[PDB]
Paper text:
A central part of the bacterial flagellar motor is the MS-ring, which is composed entirely of multiple copies of the FliF subunit. Major functions of this ring are to support the assembly of the switch and to stabilize the assembled motor. Starting at the N-terminus, each FliF protomer begins with a predicted transmembrane helix, TM1, followed by a set of domains termed ring-building motifs (RBMs). From the N-terminus, these include RBM1, RBM2, and RBM3, with RBM3 further divided into RBM3a, a ß-collar, and RBM3b.
MS-rings containing 33 subunits represented ~80% of the population (49,944 particles). The 3D map of the 33-mer RBM3 had an average resolution of 2.9 Å, with local resolutions between 2.6 Å and 3.4 Å. We therefore built an atomic model into this map. At a global level, each RBM3 appeared to exhibit the same fold as previous models. However, an overlay of our structure with that reported by Johnson et al resulted in an RMS deviation of 1.2 Å, which is greater than would be expected for two structures of identical sequence at ~3 Å resolution. We therefore evaluated whether the RMS deviation could be artificially high because of a difference in angle between the β-collar and RBM3. As a minor note, residues 395–401 of RBM3 in the 33-mer were associated with clear density but were not included in the previously published models. The correlation of these densities with the stabilization of RBM3 residues 395–401 potentially suggests an architecture with discrete membrane-spanning domains.
Residue numbers in the entry:
A (entry chain A), B (entry chain B), C (entry chain HA): 228 to 307, 354 to 438
């Protein structure tokens, strides 16, 4: 089981780099040792390939390309009446064509979850007090930008403020 | 039975890493030695392959691509009446096509279950008392983010608060 | 897992170069050590190929090229009346054609996120005060130009002003 052992080490490095990035950005604002963050990562390890072929529509006559055409009219009016109208048409077309071949990578990030806790000092000498809502929102925005939120990917973030021991 | 012996070791490492992650995040809030967590993991070890082929629909004329077409009208009005309308049409199309080949990985996580117990101190010198509902909710959210909840996957979490010995 | 280890190092260099560029441009305005910035990057590592083939339309007669043509009129007026008009036409065309083959690069930037924090001095000796809106807008514009905003790509920027410790 050598493959699984190496895979676990790779996932540890991804989380380690993100963890210290959040610590570094928030360290000056709150303090050197008043922030803690833990990051868990889910990685895709499957091998995938994809081939796509697309054709541009040519229903409209203005945007159509023709290689050959045949077109015959027959029309006989009779009096003394009959009207034997007749029409035949054959058309050949040259169409646009696009092909993309994609071989995806192994080790991408599928989803991330980060939890951050901050301390209660709030004062030089008085009793600890909760932080302001605006400051909490600023901290949330900064850690969100640091970690790389993507709503469509499915990221989750949770930050709580509580006293330390 | 060398394969099964190595498989058991791999499952132990996955649970070990998750266990200390929950301990580290919750250690400052409650204390150094006032938290205990145990993690059990179910791993998929089957070999799977999959091939998918998809075609884009072309029922609508506006989004259709044509290589050739034949179309003949015949229409004879007679008087003295008969109306022998006739129509023939033959069409050929060029269709989009996409192929993905996927070879899945061995050793993924199918489901996780974690149980966490926290202590009763609640006071410097008085008798132990239960923790607050808000603090319990914060602890639950933090451990959920640390462990990586996924509702569709089937994860289960249970946290209880009780005295220690 | 040697490929993933090297990939992580490459992403670190991209963020490192951008980080010091923002620091250098904003250093004289605010101060030597009154600015902090952290950059996270998402890189595409997939292998992709694409082939495109396009044909210019030739529906209009003025912009059409002909290699051969056949065209026969028959028209019989009878009196004592019948009018047996008849028309046949066959046309061949020479069409324009363009082919581009593209092999994309590996390691491009898909999206960037930067968070910047600035300090409160605002005075030589008095209490710290918030910076002006115009100065904040100037700082935002300068860091945006330094980092390389692209609206269609999906870039995100967040700058907040708060006291330091």
């Amino acid at each position: 089981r050598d493959l699984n052992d190496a895979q676990l080490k790779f996932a540890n490095d991804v989380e380690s780099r993100i963890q210290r990035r959040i610590e570094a950005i928030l360290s000056p604002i709150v303090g050197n040792g008043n922030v803690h963050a833990q990051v868990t990562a889910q990685l895709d390890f499957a091998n995938k390939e994809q081939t796509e072929e697309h054709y541009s529509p040519n229903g409209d006559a203005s945007k159509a390309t023709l290689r050959s055409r045949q077109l015959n009219i027959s029309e006989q009016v009779g009096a003394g009446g009959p009207r034997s109208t007749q029409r035949n048409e054959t058309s050949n077309y040259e169409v646009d064509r696009t092909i993309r071949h994609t071989k995806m990578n192994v080790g991408d990030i599928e989803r991330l979850s980060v939890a951050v806790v901050v301390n209660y000092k709030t004062l030089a000498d008085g009793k600890p007090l909760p932080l302001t809502a605006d400051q909490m929102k600023q901290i949330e925005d900064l850690t969100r930008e640091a970690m790389g939120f993507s709503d469509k990917r499915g990221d989750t973030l949770n930050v709580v403020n509580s006293p330390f021991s």
